[PDB]
A paper describes a structure:
[name] ([name], encoded by the gene [name]) is a type I BMP/TGF-β receptor that mediates signalling in endothelial cells via phosphorylation of SMAD1/5/8. [name] synergises with Notch in stalk cells to induce expression of the Notch targets HEY1 and HEY2 and thereby represses tip cell formation and angiogenic sprouting. [name] signals via phosphorylation of the transcription factors SMAD1/5/8, which act synergistically with NICD to induce the expression of Notch target genes, including HEY1 and HEY2. Here, we determined the crystal structure of the [name] intracellular kinase domain and explored the effects of a small molecule kinase inhibitor K02288 on angiogenesis.
Residue numbers in the entry: 0, 195 to 265, 270 to 493
Write the structure that this text describes.
């Protein structure tokens, strides 16, 4: 029972606030936990995330660990492992990355996404899962400087066995800054599971860029900026993104000094292969994972 794990947790510090609700650092029997208190406008994300975490055997180093879910005037809680560095967004804000570290975050993030995407058969297996809101804010950085993916509120699942896409009822859509061209065009086939995987991949490419920008080479490193920082305002409208990504056919600038290296020459090419306009031309998460370790 998750009931009393919510009852004993003491809330100590609010480490995040937004339209999704709030995230707090909490103490439970000496150890630190994260407690996400959802906003009224995002109740359906709590439901979907509660269903998936209770229903799917998902535990993995590179996926945020689940502890409990509670309905504790009305308020919905999700209690999980706590990670001090916060999100990849937060980490990339303050820290610069040695090439080795850039690859470590990149590979571990790719492990998380591959694990989500790939169906594992058998009693201890899991259906194929697509995230649908992959972004640097929804990836945490652990103590060992490896990533793990969070926020399954919009996830969609599918088995090879039964072809009907398990979709929730959430009105929420993907974060606009990260939406693929086919989502902004509304040309995506919403009854095909592979489509949703291909939008995760697009978004993944954008996260690589964010890591790349913050990586040290020849003692050059840029300050943190989000993807498309040079073409859209802070909370880009769908229409702002539609114009940039579909009409103007823009993709983030690949550092014009991205190819003057061995280990970070490939990252540039891999970035390109997440951003192909035709979704089926894109690399799969498994192929990205493999390439990443293939080059260590
Ligand atoms: C998406 C992402 C995360 C979660 C989480 C979640 C789990 N852990 N965690 C930690 C932070 C966090 C901690 C500390 C900091 N700082 C300390 C270092 N300096 C920068 C500010 C910043 C951020 C935020 N969210 C979470 C729980 C539930 N749903 C999620 C959905």
């Amino acid at each position: 029972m998750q009931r009393t794990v919510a009852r004993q947790v003491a809330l100590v510090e609010c480490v995040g606030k937004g339209r999704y609700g709030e995230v707090w650092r909490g103490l439970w029997h000496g150890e630190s936990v994260a407690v996400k208190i959802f906003s009224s406008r995002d109740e359906q994300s709590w439901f979907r995330e509660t269903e998936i975490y209770n229903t799917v055997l998902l535990r993995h180093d590179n996926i945020l660990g689940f502890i409990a879910s509670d309905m504790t005037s009305t308020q919905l809680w999700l209690i999980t492992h706590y990670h001090e560095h916060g999100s990849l967004y937060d980490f990339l804000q303050r820290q610069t990355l040695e090439p080795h570290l850039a690859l470590r975050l990149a590979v571990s993030a790719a492990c998380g996404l591959a694990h989500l995407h790939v169906e594992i058969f058998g009693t201890q297996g899991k259906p194929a899962i697509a995230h649908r809101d992959f972004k640097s804010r929804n990836v945490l950085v652990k103590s060992n400087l490896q990533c793990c993916i969070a926020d399954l509120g919009l996830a969609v699942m599918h088995s090879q066995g039964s072809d009907y896409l398990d979709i929730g009822n959430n009105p929420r859509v993907g974060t606009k800054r990260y939406m693929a061209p086919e989502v902004l065009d509304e040309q995506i086939r919403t009854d095909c599971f592979e489509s949703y995987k291909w939008t995760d991949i697009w978004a993944f490419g954008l996260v690589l860029w964010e890591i790349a920008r913050r990586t040290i080479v020849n003692g050059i490193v840029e300050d943190y900026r989000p993807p498309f920082y040079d073409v859209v305002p802070n909370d880009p409208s769908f229409e702002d993104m539609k114009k940039v990504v579909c009409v103007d056919q823009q993709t983030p600038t690949i550092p014009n000094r991205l190819a003057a290296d061995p280990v970070l020459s490939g990252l540039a090419q891999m970035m390109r292969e997440c951003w192909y306009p035709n979704p089926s031309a894109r690399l799969t998460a498994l192929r990205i994972k493999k390439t990443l370790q293939k080059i260590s």
